[PDB]
Amino acid sequence: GTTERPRLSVFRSNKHIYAQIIDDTKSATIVSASTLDKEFGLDSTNNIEAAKKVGELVAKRALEKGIKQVVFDRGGYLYHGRVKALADAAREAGLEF
């Protein structure tokens, strides 16, 4: 996120929704969590409940890293579907970036 597209990223990793926050122009987190996370274990991120578990944890630390939370990439939309949870966790936390 320093040439490609510095911002909170939200994409669907195969059958699960990967929540990924990458700093913008100031700073933030450069990681997150999805089905490939630990706390989730063997399959779980399929439902934002899990991806949101850590996807949010990383999110929180993200809004504080830079200054404020980051903005969803493209698959995050205004929030209403599934991917929304990821960008939402950061959203509700305070989406500014």
Side-chain angles (χ1 to χ4, degrees):
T2 181
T3 288
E4 307 288 88
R5 49 177 58 168
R7 64 180 71 200
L8 154 49
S9 298
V10 299
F11 32 113
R12 294 182 296 199
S13 256
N14 297 135
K15 291 77 64 176
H16 319 230
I17 29 62
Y18 205 129
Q20 175 186 270
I21 339 298
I22 165 55
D23 56 271
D24 48 282
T25 63
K26 185 65 64 181
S27 166
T29 54
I30 322 174
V31 262
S32 184
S34 78
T35 188
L36 285 317
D37 206 53
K38 293 178 295 181
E39 296 180 85
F40 312 166
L42 297 175
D43 303 272
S44 174
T45 296
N46 42 30
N47 174 213
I48 37 265
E49 177 178 86
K52 183 196 186 68
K53 174 215 299 298
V54 179
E56 181 183 274
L57 175 58
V58 55
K60 180 171 60 179
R61 53 179 301 174
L63 52 66
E64 52 170 72
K65 271 307 189 182
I67 298 298
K68 324 269 187 51
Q69 195 39 254
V70 231
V71 196
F72 62 99
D73 174 70
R74 185 61 177 187
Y77 29 92
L78 290 70
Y79 317 143
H80 173 125
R82 310 304 93 182
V83 184
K84 60 93 191 299
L86 322 190
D88 176 273
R91 179 54 185 272
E92 189 178 82
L95 168 56
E96 306 289 292
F97 248 155

